[model samples]
Structures are given as structure tokens and as C-alpha cells.
Target chain A: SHHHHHHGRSAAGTMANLDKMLNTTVTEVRKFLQADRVCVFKFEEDYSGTVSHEAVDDRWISILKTQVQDRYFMETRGEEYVHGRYQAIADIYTANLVECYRDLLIEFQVRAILAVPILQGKKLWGLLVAHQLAGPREWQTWEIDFLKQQAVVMGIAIQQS
Target chain B: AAGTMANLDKMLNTTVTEVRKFLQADRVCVFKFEEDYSGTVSHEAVDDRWISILKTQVQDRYFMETRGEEYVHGRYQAIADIYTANLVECYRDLLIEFQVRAILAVPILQGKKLWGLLVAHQLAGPREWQTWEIDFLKQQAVVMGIAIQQS
Candidate 1:
């Protein structure tokens, strides 16, 4: 069983339930896609993104945060490559982006990246992103479909609450 | 003309009250859409907490966002703490001031066009929602859309 730690002391402050939702969401997606690393990000209306919640392999968090969060995930970069595939970050821009991230991706030596937009109307609400750290990877049609299904569930959850 | 107008007003008020009770929400608002698709809340009903927040805070921030858009129908679940979401931030302080916690909104649409919207607010913590809850709300939305069209 997963024991998610609650952030705040009060009943309202606790996120144990939310964590369970995220865990279940990621586990199902991971199994279906066979992805080595799966992460979710929510974008605010002001064009800032936050790691409001995440469920990932514990060992990979440090590397993922340093490598991905600190580097090319800025507003400027986000504006440039907000839609579709982002190969340059994985191949050419890897070294530069990895420097601040401390060569963390290279240390793990992950390859390939894919990102899908979570849209509300014409606005980009956030992204559902995944990576394969162990080998060269290409997203199959079924994998994209699986992600899309999960995205719908996420969208509904986001909308209702 | 006065008698007919009075009857119409009474009818609209009754419809709004019924929707609020059915959803178990603190408030229900009906927005009217123009030919070009812009819309405004033509009618509203509110419990005490919702009235305080809507009049004091939410009305200003969310009015434009809701009215300016042509299409506004979808189901959303709050994954993060509602107080933390970008959309919620504008009203967070005021909501906090009033001790409000959770919220949900469903757009009222007619024949593929947005006619208006319905919103629910909770002064308590986050509202737990099930698929059935969404179905219930969707049913209410359909009824609301028809009512707006008739009006």
C-alpha cells in the first residue's frame, strides 16, 4: 500500500487523498505506456507552471527536478515548444540544459521525450509529459491514445473540483 | 404589460430556486448569450456564503472570463488545493476571508452553443464528487439550458 505523507496538520491541509489519486493515475499510465518516467505539470493562467502534484519513481525525483525543472522548462522555452514533440531538448540542447540540472539526465542516461498539451478551450492548462531514460524511444499510437484517455479523466477531475 | 412581465419574472425565479435545491448548492446563476455568443448572468440565486463571496469578490474576477468566452461547457475536478489554482487565486483571499473552500461550475449550452452557466460553491472543504454527481449536474444543466432558451 502507498503511504503518502500529508503536507499540512489540519484535515483540509492534508493531501493524502490527492496523492492517492495521482499515484493511481501514474501507475496505470506507466503500466500501459511502459514509460520509464512519467510526470505531470499544471499550468496557471499567468503562464507559470507548478509541480502542484506528481507521482513518480522515488529514486528519479532528484534527477528529474534538477534536470527538467531547473533548465529548459521556463516561460520563454515553453512559448517556443509548447505543442507537439520536443527533440532538440533531448538531443542538441541536452548538454546546455543539463548543466544547471548537473548532467542528471546523462548520469541516468535517459533518451527520448514526449509531451502532450492539456487544453481548456484554446488555453493550455498544462502538459502530460513522459520520458524513456533507458533507451531510444518512439511513442506508439496506442500509447498516445492511452495518455489521451488519462488526460480526459484528469480534465474532468480538474473541472469538477 | 406589467402583469405579463410580473408572471415572467416569477417563473424565472422559481426555475432558479428549483435548480439550486436540486444540486444542493449554495448558488445557481443563469447567463444569457447574445447572437454573437457573448453572455452575461441575467439571473442568480445564492445562499448566504455564496452571496457574500460573489458580490464581494468572485463577480469582479470571473465575470469577464465567463462572459467574454463563446463556449463554456466542461467538467473539471480540482487536483490541487483549490486555493492554490491560478483561477482560484484571484478570489483566494476573499474566499479565505469568508472561510469558503470548494467550488464547481457547469456551462449551460443549447444546440452546440453556450447559453449560460451554473456554479456551486462550498464554504467547507473540498467537495467530493462522483460520476453520478456529474451526471446529476449535467441533467440540471440541460434543464437550465432549455429554461434560458424559453426565457
Candidate 2:
């Protein structure tokens, strides 16, 4: 159990082993960043998405394999952050975003978030996202950086596949 | 910037072979630091005395916080003899598996940030790394940094 902290589950391997690695990264990162749920949000061509992999708190619920649509994100606001930039929301409740936008997240009771892009070459393939269940919280730099790094490894996984 | 990156790649590639010869090390590698902070082996020079670790993954799971410190402040790790370096046991075991007896690593910086790493390895036997060799690699790393900023 102690060894799992560093090596994560399923020791030494390649991108071929990414299936298990993503899950491990999710759970490990969720715990590391002290977030409630961590999900790999993959984007479809139309900008719809699926939570392909997730790590959730036992008290919280899972959104695994769920489909979602966010035209607002797909259309304009989402494209603002592409390369070398990321999105972080301290509190969805008072983030001062569109009411429709806040309502979209309220559907899942999301209170805070740190979202990073998973890019394949220049294309924005997906997002590596962290969710906070409790009330308004300020996201930390390391958490943001860590998720971005994982997004990179996720790129390797996606590329290899 | 494109011109600078091209020159940087050539210079880094040249350094690996030159440093490997001068230090008599078994292998030298230049890994480019990506946005995700993962190092991709952009260049390599090997002695044929050892098999290539290229085309394969480098498993060095470590702290994210410390990663920035390495690049931004110029972290240098010089192990004259791996066995005596008191490396963490698991990493030591990994080095043993690779038949690597010594290593010298310098951060390639882009400004205060790390652009990647310039690493020299000794696999034939344990090496007592000289200070000049260590300084030489660090200088090469700085040049790579200059190239990155130009890019």
C-alpha cells in the first residue's frame, strides 16, 4: 500500500499500459490535489464529450462514461485557452461567468475546477479536469501544473493508441 | 526562432558526441523539456558498448514541485560513482539494471525556466567525474537555453 503512493498501481510499463495508467493517474492525482473527482474528458469532433476515465470520492458520485454537451465551451469561450494557457475557477457559484454556464456546472454540484487541455499536435483533443466538491476554493499552482503534465502523458497515451 | 531552434538542435547533438568522447562516458542524451514538463529524448549519443534506452520509456516518477526547481534554478546532479552516491534505493536499483555506474546531468534553461536536460552516462564502469567535465556540460546547457529563448 505504501509503495503505491509513488509508483502508483501496476508497476513499470509503456504507453501500451496507458489504460491502467490513466486510471492510476486519476486516482493518484485526485488524492494528491485533494480534489473530489478527477476525470479525463475527451472531446468529440462536434465538441460533445465523454468522461472516459474518472477517480471519484466514495462519498461523491461517478460520472464515468457519461456523455455531455457544452455548446458554449465548444463555440467561443473555450477556444480562448489553447496552448501554454489553462482555465481555473475558484468557485463556480460566483465565478461571474454566464448564468447558463454556472447552471451547466450546478447540474453536477461542481464548486471549483482546474482544467487543462490534452492536445494532440495542434488539435485540442480533450481535457484533464479536476473537480472540487466543497465550497469555493482557490486552486493551487502545483495542482494546475500537475494536471497539465498528466495531460502531456495522456497525449502520449492517445498518440500511441 | 526557427533558425535558432535548428542551430540549437545541431549544437546539442554535437555536444553529446563530443562530451561522450571527452569524458569517455558510455552514453549522452539531450532531452527537450516539453510544456507538460516531460523530457523527450531529442538527441542521443551512445558507445555501442551499451544498448540504447531510446525508443523506450524513462521511468523516473518524482515530485512535480521539485521539477521546476531543477529547470528554473539550474539543478545539477553529478554522481562520480552511482554506488557511492547514496541514490535512493529504487533509483539505485534502476541504475544497476541499466549497468550505469555514473551520471552527470545539467538543466538546459530557457531564461530561468528549464528547456530540458543535458545528461551524460557511464555504463562501461564506474567513473570519477572531473569538475571540468561537469562545468563543460553546464556550459553546453546554458547555450541550449539561449537557443530556446531565441525560439
Candidate 3:
């Protein structure tokens, strides 16, 4: 009886292991990129907008939530951006459209922005966005390839989950 | 049509063989993760003395533990010898049998989850992997993730 229970427990333990594996992979990939912040966001069925956000670093999270929220940056222009689109808005100074959002970007002094929509088949599952705060840094070809690959893996994991 | 199994066998064999050469490693092996996440050695490269020992003696427990944990990206050294500590006691005989001295394992992940792991080892001495080499291996893992998902 005891042995059987232990075996059941071990088998049941696999789910937690699976979650850990996924979390660790996200962390490791973020570290590899050397990005100040790496966030993975998912879209719900209706595609209202971001359903969930996972941040690798807390400071980035804080700045994102408090400052980014007040600006309404995504709410105003996020939908118009379309799905499965990768954009890096280089000129933050001259391209002023919205108030709270534009002000926040300027306040933070964020120069380069890289945003990639996460797509599973034709549907837009979510988005993976990274920010480089120092200045405008050109996105590399390999980095884009790596992110696309990661997105594919994310899609599978999402299906399994 | 008749040689399907043989063709699959040759493809698998050639993959591990070519990966070893491309990565410049003494040995390389691909393991299959059971639905339970326990790993079983599926393929190997190089005809070393330790092959038989690794096959018979080594357990997939360490790799199993790795599967249980999240993705790992660091270097761990064994106290007595770098190579000796790479494999556990249950696997020591197998490592010795394979005559492997050092090892590096990188996880293959899809999205937030780990699909499997890739391991490379050397028999002579502690082989310090270059940063670029590790990065390339990581890239390979990404590629593997796609191929596995597609399959």
C-alpha cells in the first residue's frame, strides 16, 4: 500500500516539474538575451488585449505596471498595431500622438522598443516584447530568429498546458 | 518503402554523428523523454570503451531530475574530478565505461516548457565550453524544439 502511494505521489509530482521546466526556460532565455526586461504576454480568445504578463525582473515590472499603465499606451494604439507584427518604434521624441503614453515614454527615456506578436496558426495568442532603455539599439537578425523559435515552443507548450 | 526503418536508423545515426562533429565534441547522445519525463539513451556517437558501461550501468535519474526542474544554465564541477562528478554514482561506472571526463547538458525548450535535453561529453580532460559554443548549442536546442514539435 505504502509503495503504491509513493509511486502515485511521484507520478503526480510530474506536473510541478513541468511548470518548473517552463519557468526556468523562460528565465534562462531572458538572461541569454541580456535584456533589462523580458515579458511574455498572452491574449485571450476575444483578443481584448493582454490577458497575462510574466516579467523576468521586478524593477522592470514596477516600471511597466505603474508608469506604463498610467500612459494608456497599449490601450490607445495596441489594437491598431495588428497581430503577428514585429515593431521597433525608433523615434520617440518626434512621434508624439497621445498624452499619458507619450509622456511616460519620454519620462522613462526609452529609445528603442521591440515588440513581437505571438501567433499560433492564424490566431494571435499573445506578444513577447523587450525594451532596451539606454538608447536605440538595432534588433539583430539572429535575435529575431531566436524569438520566433521561442514563440513556436511557446505555442506547443500552450497547447499542452 | 522497404528501407523505412533502415532509413530512419541511418538518419538518426547520421544526426548524432554530424552533431558531434559540428560541435567538436568527443561524444554526443540523444535521449528520449518518456511521457513520465524519464530519459532513455536513444542514440550515441563515437566507439569509445565506455559505451557498453554507459548503456548497462548508467541510469537516467540525473536527467530525470533535470526534467523535473526548470531550464538550467550554469556550470557545475565535481569535487574529485570534473568528469567524475558529471555523472552520479549509479552513472559513474557507465561514465568510466564510456571513459568520459567532462560533460555539458543544455535543455531543449518550447515556450515556457522544456521538451528535452542535449548532452555532450569528453573523455580526456575538463573541456571548457566557449561562450559562443554554448550559444550555438542553445540555438541548436531551439531548432530541436521546433523539429520535435513538428514531429
lDDT of 3 by residue, A66-156 (tens): 3133222233233222222354554555554476656655665456556665555545666676665655666675676576567668767
DockQ scores of the candidates: 0.02, 0.02, 0.01
| lDDT per residue (tens digit) for residues A61-92 in model 2 | 77888888877556632343332346678888
Point out the higher-scoring one by lDDT: 1 or 2: 2
TM-scores, all candidates, are 0.41, 0.47, 0.40
For model 3, the docking class works out as incorrect
Best-to-worst TM-score order: 2, 1, 3
Candidate 1: list runs displaced more than 4 Å: A1-161, B1-12, B31-41, B48-81, B84-88, B94-99
What is the CA-based DockQ of model 1?
0.02
How good is chain A of candidate 1, measured by TM-score?
Answer: 0.59
Off by over 4 Å in 2: A1-17, A76-79, B1-151
Model 1, B1-151: lDDT tens per residue?
5576566557656776786777675655555556544455566677765443332323444445435231332323321135544445655775566554665555677665565555555554666544465566567778766655665
lDDT of 2 at B148: 59
- The interface RMSD for candidate 1 is 12.2
| lDDT of model 3, residue B135 | 67
lDDT, candidate 2, residue B34? Answer: 52
Ranking by lDDT: 2, 3, 1
Tell me the deviation in Å of residue B12 in model 3. 4.2
